[PDB]
RNA sequence: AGGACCGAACCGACUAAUGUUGAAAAAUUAGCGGAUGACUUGUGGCUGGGGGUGAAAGGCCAAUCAAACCGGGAGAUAGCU
RNA sequence: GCUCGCCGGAAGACCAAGGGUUCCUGUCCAACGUUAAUCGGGGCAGGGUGAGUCGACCCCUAAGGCGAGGCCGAAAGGCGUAGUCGAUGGGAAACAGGUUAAUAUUCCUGUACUUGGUGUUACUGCGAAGGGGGGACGGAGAAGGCUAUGUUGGCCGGGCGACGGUUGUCCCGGUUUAAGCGUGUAGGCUGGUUUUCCAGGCAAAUCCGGAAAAUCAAGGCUGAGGCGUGAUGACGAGGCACUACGGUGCUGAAGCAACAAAUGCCCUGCUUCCAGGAAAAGCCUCUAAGCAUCAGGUAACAUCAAAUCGUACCCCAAACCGACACAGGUGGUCAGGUAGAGAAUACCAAGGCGCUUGAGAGAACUCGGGUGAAGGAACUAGGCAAAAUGGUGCCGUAACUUCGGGAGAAGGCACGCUGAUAUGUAGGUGAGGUCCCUCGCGGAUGGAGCUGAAAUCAGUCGAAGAUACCAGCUGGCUGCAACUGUUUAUUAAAAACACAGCACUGUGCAAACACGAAAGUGGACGUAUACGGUGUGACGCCUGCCCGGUGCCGGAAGGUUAAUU
RNA sequence: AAUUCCUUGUCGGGUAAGUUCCGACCUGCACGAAUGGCGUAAUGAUGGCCAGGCUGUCUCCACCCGAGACUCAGUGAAAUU
RNA sequence: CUUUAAUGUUUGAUGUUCUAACGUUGACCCGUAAUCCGGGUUGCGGACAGUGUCUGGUGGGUAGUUUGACUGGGGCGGUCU
């Protein structure tokens, strides 16, 4: 659900909340965690190559599957659970054979719901089938860019792929960003929408919630000491020159896709 | 419940006076601000010089920074004292 | 040595880091000490640091480091797999008393405990570089039950007062005792037990997990403290023999209860929230490869080993970092009494210092402070500074407003002491006794005793009763920024910087981008409700006209147009 | 007006008197709508202004308590030249 | 020798298709109790991508420099034969 707090204190008048009690109310299962080390936006020269980043909350890494090639073994889940490395919750599923694993949730499962991976699996949210038997004109999620290495497109919190057509090999789809794509008709695909679309919707209403998400300060540029920044400087809020990067480069408009290896699978690219 | 409140420890450093070959190569006394947090601290580790880092001041990088220190080219050049 | 003075949440006590003999004793006084110096953290000599349980080493691992191969790189060399290192973390074991001029839970006494090795006896399925469980973990809040500690009484011992009174409801001192062993309570978690079956746990599996039936509801685990033992002891205020008043032998009475009570323990818990909260090993189990009248594993006893390094002293300082015996800086632990909300603040105990130049005089003038005639900001750039305000409870509290606030608005009233209501109340705690029992650290009754507010009434003293330290000045208009915060260490705390939110734009994953000659890494083990960049800067009303220029995004006919031919 | 040169613009407010301050006027030398415009409760060791209260801030200083200064003994610098 | 079509060969261009180089930060196997690497099999792309040399454009992102003299101070103006 979704609820704005009361204005009994500075920085707590805007800032809303997306309450959900369906999430556990405990700690996940261990078996599926792992170590995960904030980075600091650093690399292994220790030069920051992205910039703000630095602390947050400690975190633990989720074994989410994003292959779903436990096929012809229906699952049902167990429980909701809250999921920092990405905006999307997960459920707790547990297969017949008495494994367990993570997934994404669509937008209405539920505890105790059935899924069953696979081409002989029904067409519900939440089964995964390769893209050949889905059909034209639904919506899908978690989808494939090549197969046996797990889905890639739309993991966001209420993101999803909507199939729309298909010729032969491969499968033209629509993707959140309005793009055209084509990709394999081979590739596994998973029914409905990711279900956390209220997640658009939280406001932080504070400056020290975006340190918890571990995002440092942004500094502008406009006064920046020359030295530092092409914006520079000067006596005032001058700033008569374009809009440019550091390491000069517009940011208003100059398109910077230098791949040349696909040249096969962009259709509409955008706008 | 709170980047909430009064207020010590603790981190700060707004003003004044003293001190200005000072007790101190930036401190002291009287008051002051914050004080469950974007807080603070210990131990160790990473980022190295036109580079790092920077809630950004051209600030910080061993009391030194509009480009650190050491040694070297080097007895630089100096139509200037 | 007798006094006075100062800290006493330290200016006391115990350590890490660091220093490295500054430690104790004797001797010495040139130099060092901001003076003298018989003294000294000074000089010379000598002595001093005792560990199976503290710590390190060691076992395991984090960020991270090196890196056999290998990838990459003019050379140097760079990254990195397997692996190996790396604490600030995880991992077995000791408490009290006594003692040295200087060392200790290290030595002595007493009482214990732990992990291994070997051997003996009996019963036996033992085994890994594997599997699984566990270890294993966040913030905030809320109480409840306890202890350390403290208070009063009782008891024991002594005392009868330099000056009125002091054989009493009087004064002083003491009433301490551990780990360990057993008890397993307050309370927390959890439904167990037996069998059959299974796409999973890389192979196997009796353990994990999963599934279907049966059967009893009490089963087990965690767990402060209390109680008993440990302890017929030890310690013990004081006495008694040696007694150079330097000290040693023996002896040594009472050693209970009640109340209050922690920020610590039960609590790695309970409750709740979003920012969703380390790893590996040791340890407990599972079997595989393999070995079985073996080896190995288990229970008991006997026995052996538990090495090596460190331990002195200072450690908020005169011993570390600051050139000084420098008003500085420096992390962790212990946390007494009265008043108090309190680790504030004031006076004190334990304990430790009086700050390594003193004396006299009592001028200007400076520094740090007290007070003030009448006036009350006329001083001045400016109420700079100083003065004043200052607390508890009740009454009361405006425009504005994002309806939370503003607000402790402003303002007004009473605060002491004695007695009584009540020989000390409400309330808290709770004994004996009585009764019940699944007979225990139980339950209920019971209300002793202890403890202890607040309120009113009356009376009373004083100039003044929140008498001291401590402890908000308030109100009105308005600019800027929304606010909390942040920055020029060492002249700039601000209207700048950040900021939540908004917007434009890029980016379809071998993402853009950034670091790097490169491999490759971050971005991200993320996937457009996402990441990066730019600008603006909560929120509310809004964000208007112009694409000529620059740049960007696009297109097509033609013209110009490189190497190359 | 944090922008207004002429300028202490005019009028009014408050003051015995107000180049500052508040409220309007508009003749914008030279505001302007995300290098954002107009407002904005609340906050502010922020900038400016007006009151109450209280004050040695002043009229105008006076006395007192201490530490130096001054005298005596001991150790014994400095910049400058 | 003045001329014009299917063909043989020549090469030149556009397009379709294929695989054998190349790529694979796709899956699986082995070295191997190893997310590196290598090899192997397979799959998807496929003569594209990417790299190298030559070359046009762009290029304050980063460097090396210049930016005159006279002058009733200099600058501005003005002048320089």
Request: net charge positive; aromatic share 4%.
């Amino acid at each position: 659900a979704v609820v704005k707090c009361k204005p009994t204190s500075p920085g707590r008048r805007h800032v809303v909340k997306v309450v959900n009690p369906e999430l556990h109310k405990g700690k996940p299962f261990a078996p599926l965690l792992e170590k995960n080390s904030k980075s600091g936006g650093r690399n292994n020269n220790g030069r920051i190559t992205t910039r703000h980043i630095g602390g947050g909350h400690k975190q633990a890494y989720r074994i989410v599957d994003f292959k779903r090639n436990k096929d012809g073994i229906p699952a049902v889940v167990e429980r909701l659970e809250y999921d920092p490395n990405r905006s999307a919750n997960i459920a707790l599923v547990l297969y017949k054979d008495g494994e367990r694993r993570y997934i994404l949730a669509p937008k209405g499962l539920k505890a105790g719901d059935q899924i069953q991976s696979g081409v002989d699996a029904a067409i519900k949210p939440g089964n995964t089938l390769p893209m050949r038997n889905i059909p034209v004109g639904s919506t899908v999620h978690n989808v494939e860019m090549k197969p046996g290495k797990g889905g890639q497109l739309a993991r966001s919190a209420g993101t999803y792929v909507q199939i729309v057509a298909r010729d032969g090999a491969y499968v033209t789809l629509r993707l959140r960003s309005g793009e055209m794509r084509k990709v394999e008709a081979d590739c596994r695909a998973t029914l409905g929408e990711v279900g956390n679309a209220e997640h658009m919707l939280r406001v932080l209403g504070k400056a020290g919630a975006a340190r918890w998400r571990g995002v440092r300060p942004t500094v502008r540029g406009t006064a920046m000491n020359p030295v530092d920044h092409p914006h520079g400087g000067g006596e005032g809020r001058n700033f008569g020159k374009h809009p440019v990067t550091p390491w000069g480069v517009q940011t208003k408009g100059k398109k910077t896709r230098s791949n040349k290896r696909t040249d096969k699978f962009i259709v509409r690219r955008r706008s």
